[PDB]
Amino acid sequence: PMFEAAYDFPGSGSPSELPLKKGDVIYITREEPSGWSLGKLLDGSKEGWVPTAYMKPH
């Protein structure tokens, strides 16, 4: 399903993370027991880890 970022997430921890601005709608495919979710931009141009807690239903 699709989810929208509720908070900015610069994603500076690693290159495997997906930077988001508040307002960005993305696909989420998996939510992990680490507290991280795997997201993908709607145009398929990038994917990466985002904090599950930042993402609200869209």
mmCIF file with all atom_site columns, C-alpha atoms in Angstrom:
data_model
loop_
_atom_site.group_PDB
_atom_site.id
_atom_site.type_symbol
_atom_site.label_atom_id
_atom_site.label_alt_id
_atom_site.label_comp_id
_atom_site.label_asym_id
_atom_site.label_entity_id
_atom_site.label_seq_id
_atom_site.pdbx_PDB_ins_code
_atom_site.Cartn_x
_atom_site.Cartn_y
_atom_site.Cartn_z
_atom_site.occupancy
_atom_site.B_iso_or_equiv
_atom_site.pdbx_formal_charge
_atom_site.auth_seq_id
_atom_site.auth_comp_id
_atom_site.auth_asym_id
_atom_site.auth_atom_id
_atom_site.pdbx_PDB_model_num
ATOM 1  C CA . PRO A 1 1  ? 0.000  0.000  0.000   1.00 0.00 ? 1  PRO A CA 1
ATOM 2  C CA . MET A 1 2  ? 0.828  3.698  -0.172  1.00 0.00 ? 2  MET A CA 1
ATOM 3  C CA . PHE A 1 3  ? 1.907  5.785  2.836   1.00 0.00 ? 3  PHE A CA 1
ATOM 4  C CA . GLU A 1 4  ? 2.811  9.476  3.303   1.00 0.00 ? 4  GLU A CA 1
ATOM 5  C CA . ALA A 1 5  ? 5.747  10.824 5.338   1.00 0.00 ? 5  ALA A CA 1
ATOM 6  C CA . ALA A 1 6  ? 4.506  12.735 8.405   1.00 0.00 ? 6  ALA A CA 1
ATOM 7  C CA . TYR A 1 7  ? 8.020  14.033 9.256   1.00 0.00 ? 7  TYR A CA 1
ATOM 8  C CA . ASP A 1 8  ? 11.194 14.892 7.344   1.00 0.00 ? 8  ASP A CA 1
ATOM 9  C CA . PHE A 1 9  ? 13.699 12.003 7.244   1.00 0.00 ? 9  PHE A CA 1
ATOM 10 C CA . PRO A 1 10 ? 17.084 13.162 5.853   1.00 0.00 ? 10 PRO A CA 1
ATOM 11 C CA . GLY A 1 11 ? 18.387 9.551  5.686   1.00 0.00 ? 11 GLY A CA 1
ATOM 12 C CA . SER A 1 12 ? 22.010 10.364 6.499   1.00 0.00 ? 12 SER A CA 1
ATOM 13 C CA . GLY A 1 13 ? 22.750 7.123  8.374   1.00 0.00 ? 13 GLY A CA 1
ATOM 14 C CA . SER A 1 14 ? 23.544 5.014  5.286   1.00 0.00 ? 14 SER A CA 1
ATOM 15 C CA . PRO A 1 15 ? 23.192 4.939  1.474   1.00 0.00 ? 15 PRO A CA 1
ATOM 16 C CA . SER A 1 16 ? 20.573 2.184  1.911   1.00 0.00 ? 16 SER A CA 1
ATOM 17 C CA . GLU A 1 17 ? 18.138 4.645  3.468   1.00 0.00 ? 17 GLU A CA 1
ATOM 18 C CA . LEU A 1 18 ? 15.533 6.588  1.460   1.00 0.00 ? 18 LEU A CA 1
ATOM 19 C CA . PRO A 1 19 ? 15.391 10.319 2.179   1.00 0.00 ? 19 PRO A CA 1
ATOM 20 C CA . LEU A 1 20 ? 11.886 11.735 2.528   1.00 0.00 ? 20 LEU A CA 1
ATOM 21 C CA . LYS A 1 21 ? 10.349 15.143 2.949   1.00 0.00 ? 21 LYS A CA 1
ATOM 22 C CA . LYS A 1 22 ? 7.082  15.481 4.850   1.00 0.00 ? 22 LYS A CA 1
ATOM 23 C CA . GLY A 1 23 ? 4.348  15.041 2.248   1.00 0.00 ? 23 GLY A CA 1
ATOM 24 C CA . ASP A 1 24 ? 6.098  12.406 0.140   1.00 0.00 ? 24 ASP A CA 1
ATOM 25 C CA . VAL A 1 25 ? 3.792  9.491  -0.767  1.00 0.00 ? 25 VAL A CA 1
ATOM 26 C CA . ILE A 1 26 ? 5.657  6.181  -1.384  1.00 0.00 ? 26 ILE A CA 1
ATOM 27 C CA . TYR A 1 27 ? 4.939  2.434  -1.577  1.00 0.00 ? 27 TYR A CA 1
ATOM 28 C CA . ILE A 1 28 ? 5.786  0.308  1.473   1.00 0.00 ? 28 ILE A CA 1
ATOM 29 C CA . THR A 1 29 ? 6.324  -3.397 0.829   1.00 0.00 ? 29 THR A CA 1
ATOM 30 C CA . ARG A 1 30 ? 7.676  -4.687 4.203   1.00 0.00 ? 30 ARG A CA 1
ATOM 31 C CA . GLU A 1 31 ? 7.765  -3.512 7.843   1.00 0.00 ? 31 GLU A CA 1
ATOM 32 C CA . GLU A 1 32 ? 10.533 -5.139 9.917   1.00 0.00 ? 32 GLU A CA 1
ATOM 33 C CA . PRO A 1 33 ? 11.016 -5.853 13.651  1.00 0.00 ? 33 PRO A CA 1
ATOM 34 C CA . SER A 1 34 ? 14.003 -3.472 13.509  1.00 0.00 ? 34 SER A CA 1
ATOM 35 C CA . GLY A 1 35 ? 11.622 -0.481 13.287  1.00 0.00 ? 35 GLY A CA 1
ATOM 36 C CA . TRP A 1 36 ? 12.431 0.056  9.578   1.00 0.00 ? 36 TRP A CA 1
ATOM 37 C CA . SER A 1 37 ? 10.195 -0.254 6.483   1.00 0.00 ? 37 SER A CA 1
ATOM 38 C CA . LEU A 1 38 ? 11.257 -0.794 2.842   1.00 0.00 ? 38 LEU A CA 1
ATOM 39 C CA . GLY A 1 39 ? 9.883  2.025  0.665   1.00 0.00 ? 39 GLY A CA 1
ATOM 40 C CA . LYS A 1 40 ? 9.854  2.861  -3.054  1.00 0.00 ? 40 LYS A CA 1
ATOM 41 C CA . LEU A 1 41 ? 9.158  6.181  -4.833  1.00 0.00 ? 41 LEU A CA 1
ATOM 42 C CA . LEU A 1 42 ? 5.985  6.126  -6.970  1.00 0.00 ? 42 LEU A CA 1
ATOM 43 C CA . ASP A 1 43 ? 8.020  6.526  -10.198 1.00 0.00 ? 43 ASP A CA 1
ATOM 44 C CA . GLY A 1 44 ? 10.235 3.535  -9.348  1.00 0.00 ? 44 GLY A CA 1
ATOM 45 C CA . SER A 1 45 ? 13.400 5.677  -9.437  1.00 0.00 ? 45 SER A CA 1
ATOM 46 C CA . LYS A 1 46 ? 14.610 4.890  -5.895  1.00 0.00 ? 46 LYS A CA 1
ATOM 47 C CA . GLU A 1 47 ? 13.955 2.589  -2.940  1.00 0.00 ? 47 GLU A CA 1
ATOM 48 C CA . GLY A 1 48 ? 15.352 2.260  0.574   1.00 0.00 ? 48 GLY A CA 1
ATOM 49 C CA . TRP A 1 49 ? 14.760 2.093  4.319   1.00 0.00 ? 49 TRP A CA 1
ATOM 50 C CA . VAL A 1 50 ? 12.572 4.592  6.202   1.00 0.00 ? 50 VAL A CA 1
ATOM 51 C CA . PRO A 1 51 ? 11.390 4.657  9.857   1.00 0.00 ? 51 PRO A CA 1
ATOM 52 C CA . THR A 1 52 ? 8.051  2.845  10.151  1.00 0.00 ? 52 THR A CA 1
ATOM 53 C CA . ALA A 1 53 ? 6.905  5.321  12.809  1.00 0.00 ? 53 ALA A CA 1
ATOM 54 C CA . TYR A 1 54 ? 7.139  8.278  10.338  1.00 0.00 ? 54 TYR A CA 1
ATOM 55 C CA . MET A 1 55 ? 4.668  6.804  7.837   1.00 0.00 ? 55 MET A CA 1
ATOM 56 C CA . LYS A 1 56 ? 0.928  7.454  7.846   1.00 0.00 ? 56 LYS A CA 1
ATOM 57 C CA . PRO A 1 57 ? -1.792 5.707  5.796   1.00 0.00 ? 57 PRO A CA 1
ATOM 58 C CA . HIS A 1 58 ? -2.566 7.376  2.425   1.00 0.00 ? 58 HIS A CA 1
#
